[PDB]
Design a protein around this motif. Structure first.
Motif, PDB file in Angstrom:
ATOM      1  N   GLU A 101      13.749  -4.301  -1.182  1.00 50.01           N
ATOM      2  CA  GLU A 101      14.988  -3.795  -0.683  1.00 50.01           C
ATOM      3  C   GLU A 101      16.329  -3.639  -1.452  1.00 50.01           C
ATOM      4  O   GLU A 101      17.041  -2.962  -1.641  1.00 50.01           O
ATOM      5  N   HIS A 117       4.827  -3.409   9.027  1.00 55.10           N
ATOM      6  CA  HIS A 117       5.054  -4.008  10.276  1.00 55.10           C
ATOM      7  C   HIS A 117       4.319  -3.340  11.246  1.00 55.10           C
ATOM      8  O   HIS A 117       3.764  -4.015  12.211  1.00 55.10           O
ATOM      9  N   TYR A 140      19.668 -11.943  13.157  1.00 54.20           N
ATOM     10  CA  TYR A 140      20.215 -12.890  11.942  1.00 54.20           C
ATOM     11  C   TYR A 140      21.414 -12.310  11.240  1.00 54.20           C
ATOM     12  O   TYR A 140      21.380 -11.056  11.222  1.00 54.20           O
ATOM     13  N   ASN A 160      17.420  -9.356   2.284  1.00 51.59           N
ATOM     14  CA  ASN A 160      16.627 -10.371   2.252  1.00 51.59           C
ATOM     15  C   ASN A 160      15.164  -9.919   1.849  1.00 51.59           C
ATOM     16  O   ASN A 160      14.369 -11.081   1.825  1.00 51.59           O
ATOM     17  N   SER A 217       8.275 -11.093   8.378  1.00 52.98           N
ATOM     18  CA  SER A 217       8.725  -9.777   8.861  1.00 52.98           C
ATOM     19  C   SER A 217       9.716  -9.002   8.219  1.00 52.98           C
ATOM     20  O   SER A 217      10.102  -7.859   8.130  1.00 52.98           O
ATOM     21  N   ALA A 218      10.684  -9.908   7.310  1.00 55.10           N
ATOM     22  CA  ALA A 218      11.741  -9.392   6.499  1.00 55.10           C
ATOM     23  C   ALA A 218      11.118  -8.445   5.460  1.00 55.10           C
ATOM     24  O   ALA A 218      11.818  -7.527   5.124  1.00 55.10           O
TER      25      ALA A 218
HETATM   26  N1  LIG Z   1      14.466  -6.682   5.634  1.00 54.50           N
HETATM   27  C1  LIG Z   1      14.920  -6.219   6.752  1.00 54.50           C
HETATM   28  C2  LIG Z   1      13.900  -4.965   7.398  1.00 54.50           C
HETATM   29  C3  LIG Z   1      12.780  -5.411   7.861  1.00 54.50           C
HETATM   30  C4  LIG Z   1      11.992  -4.087   8.730  1.00 54.50           C
HETATM   31  C5  LIG Z   1      10.714  -4.683   8.898  1.00 54.50           C
HETATM   32  N2  LIG Z   1      10.560  -5.893   9.469  1.00 54.50           N
HETATM   33  C6  LIG Z   1      15.139  -7.193   7.827  1.00 54.50           C
HETATM   34  O1  LIG Z   1      14.732  -8.153   7.959  1.00 54.50           O
HETATM   35  O2  LIG Z   1      15.763  -6.708   8.939  1.00 54.50           O
END
Ligand SMILES: N[C@@H](CCCC[NH3+])C(=O)O
Ligand SMILES: N[C@@H](CCCC[NH3+])C(=O)O
Ligand SMILES: N[C@@H](CCCC[NH3+])C(=O)O
Ligand SMILES: N[C@@H](CCCC[NH3+])C(=O)O
Ligand SMILES: [Mg+2]
Ligand SMILES: [Mg+2]
Ligand SMILES: [Mg+2]
Ligand SMILES: [Mg+2]
Ligand SMILES: [Mg+2]
Ligand SMILES: [Mg+2]
Lengths: 296, 296, 296, 296
Positions: free
Chosen positions: D86, C57, C108, D82, C49-50
């Motif tokens: 990004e 997503h 997190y 993370n 997801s990150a």
């Molecule tokens: N990397 C960011 C954006 C994620 C957006 C889609 N999961 C996070 O983990 O919050």
């Protein structure tokens, strides 16, 4: 307050045929005196206090006292126990038999509360009239003497003058000396000797000094003289050995190193302590060749 | 393999006027017998093993053996030490004086290596011919008996039949019984008694059973009979007392509870153990009110 | 409360040339359906997801819903975020695009307080009218949803029906279901699926089920049917793979295993995730050989 | 290597009606410039990086850049994520919009391995030609950049020049500067600013400096001039506020202090972050009385 500070060594306890090698023990102590050490700690954690009988414990205190006599080297006798009546017995022995002070490890295994630790140490401090140094090593005892308890004991009992800190918590060392700057904070963790001394610490109780007493002496005395550049350089110089001496549980590496340098006859421990693995044996041997080790 | 399983109690050691109250000790043991207990563990952690002399330690083993005579209740004597020669001596004492087996805590404070733990326990197991139960409590000792070491000792020594796990690590209890399903896994953590039994654990060594021997008895026997619904029901009711009995370091709460229940005359510990705080004193008192406590 | 329980899979997200392999995604979900899985979790931790964009997503939720329409399989869409406005947006998308419920990881990095966690989830739960499952994994978020917070959120918001617990704390799992037996406790840690189910847990969100969905579903259903002997048997059989799938950080091992089984085109991650080491690659390859891996 | 060292501030991000108060942001930055600060870090952890959109994140970098032009104060823009794509995007933005360097926190939540952290930071470092400071805060990210990884990144990538450590591990700070003394070690933990600087650290990125920029500035400079007795005195004076600012999760206490000091209009915060408890509100208020707080 009466104190015991400077460069100090947690003496290993050499064994031979399952018995304390009393001649080698005295030999090792005079090697420390001859290399700038200010005090010796018989039968601490590094001296295998757990597996010595109460009689052997007392024998090694007397040998330290006898060997240091006629010198400026003080004896800070290991006197801790997780039973307060046991620690009191050890403290009174050390006073009556000529020790300059005592080190007293926080009770292990039975986890007393902070209130219990206070009463534990107040009974000890009231047992004698010589300086008492607290010793906090939570990774081995399972308990921590909080900063508040340490400060209360320092302020409430005349002969409690500081704490040997083996927690790897530089915040606590700031906490201690910012709120009670009169105490003697003692490094019980070789790798961070310089940071603790740089913050107002007044000495070390070293494991590395067993092997390299001159380097730990110079480091400490440079630091106490506020020559922080030279203290830091030796601390950085010693980092590799300082950490390799804990590849396995202390004092397994240091006794291996002392044996490899020919400073003790046999690499003997008392169970459950044992020889290191052959891999760590080789790693200890390999860090040592990069340092000059004094003989007798 | 010979084994000692089922519902067991880590007996508090009642003192009176700084001495072991041997009459109260015997009364408390038969109270465990009257309430479905299969085994008693004299002078474990909960019995303040650390602050008893070796004499007292031995006296409490003999009283337990004496009090269990004429019943099915076995005696699993606490015989651990961080010095192997001490642990062997205690093991030989328990054998010679009629104990059915021994509990042997992992060496505390000096944190031996895995190889050291193996040789520590092999010397113990070869010193006697009665069952030996390992005891892992890394929060009090500073060391862990790894799964491989436990399994190696189970397979290499005839009388080593299991482990008392007080680690709160349900992953490890799966690891142990998945790779060696013949071992006797014993819960040393009351709050998770049912999950450990649910996974093939074969008994408990309980702190709560000091106060509620009938409930811990029923819980364990339901589980052994594979009545998992009823074992869980009792485990769930006891959660509040199971946790509040660790508001402070065991056995400070359980001795406080026994005193408040009128089961011991004196609220007595040996330093560095002490009375709890007044707040935790009241919190223990308030959890007790939801449970029915058996008398003598 | 409406609920989503049973055997559930944290779906890996396969990549091809740095893009979501949407065809492989549907294939993998369909394979989960064919092996007794009750629900799938698109874009959890195992779904990276990150490193997915908000649109990628959202694409994976849409594929999961579409692929699961007309079958038994529910969609519990990953909708968590450490920013509440982000978590609310994902939750509303999942509602609007047909997901049966949402999983929402504890925020997190920014470590909100317990009061912050309540307000975070109360905002999410009030944004939609579909079931919401909390997700506690403190080793990755740096924070813990306390037991009191989970229960308060369960009792105060209708659509919060349980928690996915990945904390390795069986004590906490007893704590939750003893004080609030109506909530749905979900195992988020494969190695201890059975102990959590044995204590009244009502499902798993599994990483291992990606590779062996038949075994994880069967384990869950045995347990839910109270065949505790067969549920434990599968849990013990799966321990080696359950652990080797965390030799490196999830989902690096599971994607390695899926690739090794011929279940995905290439072993592609998005940075900062990467292929495993050469050691862990071979260790994963070899633990798989002991299990039969289902095809398409 | 070009570097950014000295006293630096992790700027809070003021909100008003849920929006970034951009005028308050500029005023706060100019207050730092006027109080001896060497650098400001827009949108770090203390800047609520998580809950700002990518657009607001970019807005606050440009405000910092614009406010510092014509002064010596450098801008070390928060650019971590993370997700490597990004993090690279933010780094390229900061480079193109006039930032002097970037700070980049270790990836949170997704726990990359050491190999992944290397590739994550190497991709970032090669995207721009301005200094890059690593940022290790394992209590928040769930991962740590090992000493070997930091050293490999410093020696292999031209613009990676140091690390901001927020780990409470003075051993690691000795490890870092003993093996790679050319790096810029930066304190990310206010309570131990002086010990890190004492060991060769070359600056701080402070939370307290939001409230007391003159004191953090003076400490840093004294230490950099090797006046350790004045630096330590300031560090000791600041201990109480340095710890109370973490009674709750940063930046909840510092924003409370700024609001109580009248430096921001509203105690806002973006969910899941929240105003502190009533007690802690009173505790921060109390602790503040012992310090002289500058106005605008
Ligand atoms: N990397 C960011 C954006 C994620 C957006 C889609 N999961 C996070 O983990 O919050
Ligand atoms: N093994 C016991 C007794 C030690 C005897 C004297 N040091 C202990 O560690 O406390
Ligand atoms: N206090 C020492 C000796 C106890 C002897 C009887 N248990 C120890 O905890 O090991
Ligand atoms: N809340 C997400 C998105 C932030 C992106 C802008 N800093 C995170 O912390 O990763
Ligand atoms: Mg001089
Ligand atoms: Mg050690
Ligand atoms: Mg006595
Ligand atoms: Mg024992
Ligand atoms: Mg921080
Ligand atoms: Mg100057």
């Amino acid at each position: 307050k009466n104190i015991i500070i400077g460069a100090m060594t947690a003496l290993i306890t050499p064994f031979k045929n399952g018995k304390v090698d009393e001649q080698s023990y005295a030999r090792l102590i005079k090697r420390q005196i001859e290399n700038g050490i200010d005090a010796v700690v018989p039968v601490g954690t590094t001296g295998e206090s757990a597996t010595l009988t109460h009689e052997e414990h007392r024998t090694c205190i007397e040998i330290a006292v006898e060997t240091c006599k006629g010198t400026k080297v003080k004896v800070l006798a290991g006197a801790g126990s997780n039973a307060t009546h046991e620690a009191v017995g050890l403290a009174k022995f050390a006073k009556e038999h000529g020790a300059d002070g005592i080190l007293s490890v926080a009770p292990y295994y039975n986890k007393p509360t902070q209130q219990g630790l206070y009463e534990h140490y107040k009974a000890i401090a009231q047992s004698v009239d010589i300086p008492v140094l607290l010793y906090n090593v939570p990774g081995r005892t399972g308990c921590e003497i909080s900063t508040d308890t340490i400060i209360k004991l320092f302020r409430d009992c005349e002969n409690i003058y500081g704490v040997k800190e083996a927690s790897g918590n530089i915040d606590k060392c700031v906490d201690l000396l910012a709120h009670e700057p009169r105490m003697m904070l003692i490094s019980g963790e070789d790798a961070i000797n310089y940071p603790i001394l740089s913050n107002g610490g007044k000495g070390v109780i070293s494991v590395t000094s067993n092997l390299l007493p001159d380097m730990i002496s110079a480091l400490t005395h440079f630091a106490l003289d506020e020559n922080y550049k030279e203290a830091k350089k030796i601390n950085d110089e010693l980092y590799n050995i300082n950490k390799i001496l804990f590849c396995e549980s202390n004092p397994i590496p240091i006794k291996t190193a002392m044996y490899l340098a020919g400073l003790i006859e046999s690499l003997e421990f008392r169970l459950p302590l044992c020889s290191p693995s052959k891999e760590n044996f080789a790693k200890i041997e390999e860090v040592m060749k990069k340092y000059k080790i004094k003989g007798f």
